[PDB]
Design an enzyme around this catalytic site. Sequence first.
Site, PDB file in Angstrom:
ATOM      1  N   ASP A  30       0.886  -1.212   0.121  1.00 46.69           N
ATOM      2  CA  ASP A  30       0.011   0.143   0.060  1.00 46.69           C
ATOM      3  C   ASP A  30       1.029   1.496  -0.102  1.00 46.69           C
ATOM      4  O   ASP A  30       1.567   1.465   1.033  1.00 46.69           O
ATOM      5  CB  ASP A  30      -0.910   0.119   1.183  1.00 46.69           C
ATOM      6  CG  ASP A  30      -1.588   1.363   1.011  1.00 46.69           C
ATOM      7  OD1 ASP A  30      -2.670   1.266   0.573  1.00 46.69           O
ATOM      8  OD2 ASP A  30      -1.523   2.258   1.904  1.00 46.69           O
ATOM      9  N   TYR A  65       2.964  10.142   0.464  1.00 44.86           N
ATOM     10  CA  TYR A  65       3.939   9.598   1.075  1.00 44.86           C
ATOM     11  C   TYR A  65       5.114   9.874   0.731  1.00 44.86           C
ATOM     12  O   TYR A  65       6.090   9.993   1.634  1.00 44.86           O
ATOM     13  CB  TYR A  65       3.926   8.052   1.500  1.00 44.86           C
ATOM     14  CG  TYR A  65       2.510   7.429   1.974  1.00 44.86           C
ATOM     15  CD1 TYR A  65       1.553   8.318   2.619  1.00 44.86           C
ATOM     16  CD2 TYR A  65       2.140   6.040   1.707  1.00 44.86           C
ATOM     17  CE1 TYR A  65       0.213   7.883   2.654  1.00 44.86           C
ATOM     18  CE2 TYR A  65       0.802   5.680   2.158  1.00 44.86           C
ATOM     19  CZ  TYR A  65       0.040   6.743   2.556  1.00 44.86           C
ATOM     20  OH  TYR A  65      -1.209   6.089   3.104  1.00 44.86           O
ATOM     21  N   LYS A  82      -2.781   6.115  -4.103  1.00 46.19           N
ATOM     22  CA  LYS A  82      -3.763   6.983  -3.850  1.00 46.19           C
ATOM     23  C   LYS A  82      -3.657   8.389  -4.479  1.00 46.19           C
ATOM     24  O   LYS A  82      -2.430   8.595  -4.634  1.00 46.19           O
ATOM     25  CB  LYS A  82      -3.809   6.968  -2.578  1.00 46.19           C
ATOM     26  CG  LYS A  82      -3.872   5.613  -1.774  1.00 46.19           C
ATOM     27  CD  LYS A  82      -4.111   5.813  -0.321  1.00 46.19           C
ATOM     28  CE  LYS A  82      -3.881   4.401   0.568  1.00 46.19           C
ATOM     29  NZ  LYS A  82      -2.198   4.348   0.868  1.00 46.19           N
ATOM     30  N   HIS A 135      -7.932   9.252  -2.023  1.00 46.29           N
ATOM     31  CA  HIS A 135      -7.351   9.011  -0.750  1.00 46.29           C
ATOM     32  C   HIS A 135      -8.051   9.549   0.263  1.00 46.29           C
ATOM     33  O   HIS A 135      -8.289   9.142   1.417  1.00 46.29           O
ATOM     34  CB  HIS A 135      -6.044  10.046  -1.001  1.00 46.29           C
ATOM     35  CG  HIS A 135      -4.968   9.445   0.323  1.00 46.29           C
ATOM     36  ND1 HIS A 135      -3.497   9.461  -0.183  1.00 46.29           N
ATOM     37  CD2 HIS A 135      -5.155   9.059   1.496  1.00 46.29           C
ATOM     38  CE1 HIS A 135      -3.066   8.877   1.167  1.00 46.29           C
ATOM     39  NE2 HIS A 135      -3.939   8.606   2.169  1.00 46.29           N
TER      40      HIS A 135
HETATM   41  N1  LIG Z   1      -6.098   5.830   3.406  1.00 46.56           N
HETATM   42  C1  LIG Z   1      -5.575   6.520   4.526  1.00 46.56           C
HETATM   43  O1  LIG Z   1      -5.936   7.785   4.729  1.00 46.56           O
HETATM   44  C2  LIG Z   1      -4.530   5.878   5.485  1.00 46.56           C
HETATM   45  C3  LIG Z   1      -4.532   6.520   6.697  1.00 46.56           C
HETATM   46  C4  LIG Z   1      -3.538   5.830   7.604  1.00 46.56           C
HETATM   47  C5  LIG Z   1      -2.662   4.943   6.982  1.00 46.56           C
HETATM   48  N2  LIG Z   1      -2.888   4.532   5.682  1.00 46.56           N
HETATM   49  C6  LIG Z   1      -2.143   3.085   5.248  1.00 46.56           C
HETATM   50  O2  LIG Z   1      -2.128   2.099   6.148  1.00 46.56           O
HETATM   51  C7  LIG Z   1      -0.854   1.865   6.683  1.00 46.56           C
HETATM   52  C8  LIG Z   1      -0.740   1.234   8.090  1.00 46.56           C
HETATM   53  O3  LIG Z   1      -1.181   2.389   9.081  1.00 46.56           O
HETATM   54  P1  LIG Z   1      -0.247   3.090   9.854  1.00 46.56           P
HETATM   55  O4  LIG Z   1       1.036   3.365   9.117  1.00 46.56           O
HETATM   56  O5  LIG Z   1      -1.070   4.505  10.004  1.00 46.56           O
HETATM   57  O6  LIG Z   1      -0.100   2.566  11.387  1.00 46.56           O
HETATM   58  P2  LIG Z   1      -0.055   0.989  11.917  1.00 46.56           P
HETATM   59  O7  LIG Z   1       0.033   0.147  10.723  1.00 46.56           O
HETATM   60  O8  LIG Z   1      -1.394   0.831  12.712  1.00 46.56           O
HETATM   61  O9  LIG Z   1       1.358   0.953  12.641  1.00 46.56           O
HETATM   62  C9  LIG Z   1       2.439   1.449  12.373  1.00 46.56           C
HETATM   63  C10 LIG Z   1       3.528   1.456  13.544  1.00 46.56           C
HETATM   64  O10 LIG Z   1       3.451   0.252  14.265  1.00 46.56           O
HETATM   65  C11 LIG Z   1       4.729  -0.155  14.463  1.00 46.56           C
HETATM   66  N3  LIG Z   1       4.821  -1.592  13.954  1.00 46.56           N
HETATM   67  C12 LIG Z   1       4.574  -2.399  13.188  1.00 46.56           C
HETATM   68  N4  LIG Z   1       4.418  -3.645  13.414  1.00 46.56           N
HETATM   69  C13 LIG Z   1       4.711  -3.953  14.930  1.00 46.56           C
HETATM   70  C14 LIG Z   1       4.767  -4.767  15.576  1.00 46.56           C
HETATM   71  N5  LIG Z   1       4.758  -6.088  15.222  1.00 46.56           N
HETATM   72  N6  LIG Z   1       4.710  -4.808  16.878  1.00 46.56           N
HETATM   73  C15 LIG Z   1       4.909  -3.394  17.334  1.00 46.56           C
HETATM   74  N7  LIG Z   1       4.669  -2.139  16.538  1.00 46.56           N
HETATM   75  C16 LIG Z   1       4.751  -2.501  15.402  1.00 46.56           C
HETATM   76  C17 LIG Z   1       5.595   0.500  13.391  1.00 46.56           C
HETATM   77  O11 LIG Z   1       6.671   0.886  13.808  1.00 46.56           O
HETATM   78  P3  LIG Z   1       8.180   0.540  12.601  1.00 46.56           P
HETATM   79  O12 LIG Z   1       7.595   0.780  11.351  1.00 46.56           O
HETATM   80  O13 LIG Z   1       9.070   1.812  13.250  1.00 46.56           O
HETATM   81  O14 LIG Z   1       8.574  -1.039  12.702  1.00 46.56           O
HETATM   82  C18 LIG Z   1       4.826   1.932  13.068  1.00 46.56           C
HETATM   83  O15 LIG Z   1       5.588   3.017  14.142  1.00 46.56           O
HETATM   84  C19 LIG Z   1      -0.004   3.214   6.305  1.00 46.56           C
HETATM   85  O16 LIG Z   1       1.236   2.766   6.533  1.00 46.56           O
HETATM   86  C20 LIG Z   1      -0.603   3.390   5.033  1.00 46.56           C
HETATM   87  O17 LIG Z   1       0.032   2.604   3.898  1.00 46.56           O
HETATM   88  C21 LIG Z   1      -3.860   4.846   4.994  1.00 46.56           C
HETATM   89  C1  LIG Z   2      -3.969  10.597   8.262  1.00 47.00           C
HETATM   90  C2  LIG Z   2      -2.688  11.337   7.537  1.00 47.00           C
HETATM   91  C3  LIG Z   2      -1.890  10.307   6.695  1.00 47.00           C
HETATM   92  C4  LIG Z   2      -1.750   8.830   6.849  1.00 47.00           C
HETATM   93  C5  LIG Z   2      -1.871   8.081   5.352  1.00 47.00           C
HETATM   94  O1  LIG Z   2      -2.684   8.487   4.675  1.00 47.00           O
HETATM   95  O2  LIG Z   2      -1.623   6.968   5.104  1.00 47.00           O
HETATM   96  C6  LIG Z   2      -0.792  11.216   6.212  1.00 47.00           C
HETATM   97  C7  LIG Z   2       0.192  10.770   5.222  1.00 47.00           C
HETATM   98  C8  LIG Z   2       0.992  11.838   4.897  1.00 47.00           C
HETATM   99  F1  LIG Z   2       2.057  11.461   4.199  1.00 47.00           F
HETATM  100  C9  LIG Z   2       0.818  13.185   4.954  1.00 47.00           C
HETATM  101  C10 LIG Z   2      -0.498  13.636   5.669  1.00 47.00           C
HETATM  102  C11 LIG Z   2      -1.057  12.571   6.226  1.00 47.00           C
HETATM  103  C12 LIG Z   2      -2.274  12.647   7.132  1.00 47.00           C
HETATM  104  C13 LIG Z   2      -2.965  13.792   7.573  1.00 47.00           C
HETATM  105  C14 LIG Z   2      -2.966  15.104   7.361  1.00 47.00           C
HETATM  106  C15 LIG Z   2      -1.916  15.771   8.307  1.00 47.00           C
HETATM  107  C16 LIG Z   2      -1.271  17.027   8.147  1.00 47.00           C
HETATM  108  C17 LIG Z   2      -2.040  17.867   7.026  1.00 47.00           C
HETATM  109  S1  LIG Z   2      -1.457  19.428   7.050  1.00 47.00           S
HETATM  110  C18 LIG Z   2      -2.975  20.189   7.802  1.00 47.00           C
HETATM  111  O3  LIG Z   2      -0.329  19.408   7.884  1.00 47.00           O
HETATM  112  C19 LIG Z   2      -3.031  17.203   6.330  1.00 47.00           C
HETATM  113  C20 LIG Z   2      -3.311  16.055   6.548  1.00 47.00           C
END
Ligand SMILES: NC(=O)c1ccc[n+]([C@@H]2O[C@H](COP(=O)([O-])OP(=O)(O)OC[C@H]3O[C@@H](n4cnc5c(N)ncnc54)[C@H](OP(=O)(O)O)[C@@H]3O)[C@@H](O)[C@H]2O)c1
Ligand SMILES: CC1=C(CC(=O)O)c2cc(F)ccc2/C1=C\c1ccc([S@@](C)=O)cc1
Length: 316
Positions: A44, A49, A78, A111
């Site tokens: 993903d 990013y 996205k 997104h």
């Molecule tokens: N569509 C959207 O708006 C949106 C929003 C948020 C996220 N996303 C996508 O979803 C993905 C996952 O969500 P997220 O990155 O917000 O958070 P997450 O996957 O819930 O958590 C990531 C964090 O947990 C740590 N971690 C990972 N595996 C672990 C384990 N087995 N034990 C302990 N800690 C662990 C990672 O550390 P390290 O990396 O240091 O190992 C990182 O700090 C994103 O990277 C992105 O691709 C999309």
């Molecule tokens: C929830 C969130 C994510 C997670 C994701 O999409 O995986 C993210 C990733 C990025 F590379 C940049 C911004 C965001 C974000 C929210 C957001 C934060 C600050 C701003 S401005 C106000 O500083 C705007 C939006």
Amino acid sequence: MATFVELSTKAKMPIVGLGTWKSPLGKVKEAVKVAIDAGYRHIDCAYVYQNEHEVGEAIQEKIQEKAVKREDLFIVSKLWPTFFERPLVRKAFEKTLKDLKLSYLDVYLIHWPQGFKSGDDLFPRDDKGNAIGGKATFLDAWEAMEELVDEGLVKALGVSNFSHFQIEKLLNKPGLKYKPVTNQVECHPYLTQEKLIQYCHSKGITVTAYSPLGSPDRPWAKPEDPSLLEDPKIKEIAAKHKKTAAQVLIRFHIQRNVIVIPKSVTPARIVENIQVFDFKLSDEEMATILSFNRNWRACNLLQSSHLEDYPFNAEY
Ligand SMILES: NC(=O)c1ccc[n+]([C@@H]2O[C@H](COP(=O)([O-])OP(=O)(O)OC[C@H]3O[C@@H](n4cnc5c(N)ncnc54)[C@H](OP(=O)(O)O)[C@@H]3O)[C@@H](O)[C@H]2O)c1
Ligand SMILES: CC1=C(CC(=O)O)c2cc(F)ccc2/C1=C\c1ccc([S@@](C)=O)cc1
């Protein structure tokens, strides 16, 4: 074995994927390499990013080295909402695809549903930090994205952070060519998304759970925010299976037939996070986990809450 969720297009989307938000340059290439070696196929990604060029390098390496074939990878990116105007959709997509060094994407998502001020300022905001809106809508974006599917550049489209009202607005749009195959939303035991999952599944739309570990490294965390990984009740269930909390949190989604995309750049964790097909949470454990719902969002994007298509005002 790493299983799949079948999409409406009959494509098979691997049910565990590697998230890449905030995966630093200098770590994300190795993260993708370790993931592919560990059996991940779904990655993903996103324009916003700003690391797609490194992800692309890693993918290219592993394909070159015969570790994997392109057809067996499932690459998602996205469209950021500063690019909803038609010509910008194409240009944003072209940069994503070029960065990823791919000839096509498996899924391309909107997104966020709300449009931001158009251009290459990704975070246009006022003095208070509130997002500046743009007049192009997610329907304008979708129109342009449909061309990518016509051209074979994208196999399927989807949405992210959409409420059921916004998905309805999309599905009921007269003249729609392609339907969303997934809605990527935050989901974990504190935000179980029961109504939204039910809705999406009823329409043949899969759900992809982001932040399944509660996104503990999100830049805006507040020390009073809850912590899934340290939750004694989650830990209890992990102990019951001699698994880690993260593995329980990931397996939770698998058992709801929800795709899940935990992020890590740590090789040990990347491996740990996909070791979730050799145990099963009991019906009772699943019910207990569902009961932890707090309607708590790690990603509430409050700074856009004034915008017309801000998704989180609705119940679901
Ligand atoms: N569509 C959207 O708006 C949106 C929003 C948020 C996220 N996303 C996508 O979803 C993905 C996952 O969500 P997220 O990155 O917000 O958070 P997450 O996957 O819930 O958590 C990531 C964090 O947990 C740590 N971690 C990972 N595996 C672990 C384990 N087995 N034990 C302990 N800690 C662990 C990672 O550390 P390290 O990396 O240091 O190992 C990182 O700090 C994103 O990277 C992105 O691709 C999309
Ligand atoms: C929830 C969130 C994510 C997670 C994701 O999409 O995986 C993210 C990733 C990025 F590379 C940049 C911004 C965001 C974000 C929210 C957001 C934060 C600050 C701003 S401005 C106000 O500083 C705007 C939006």
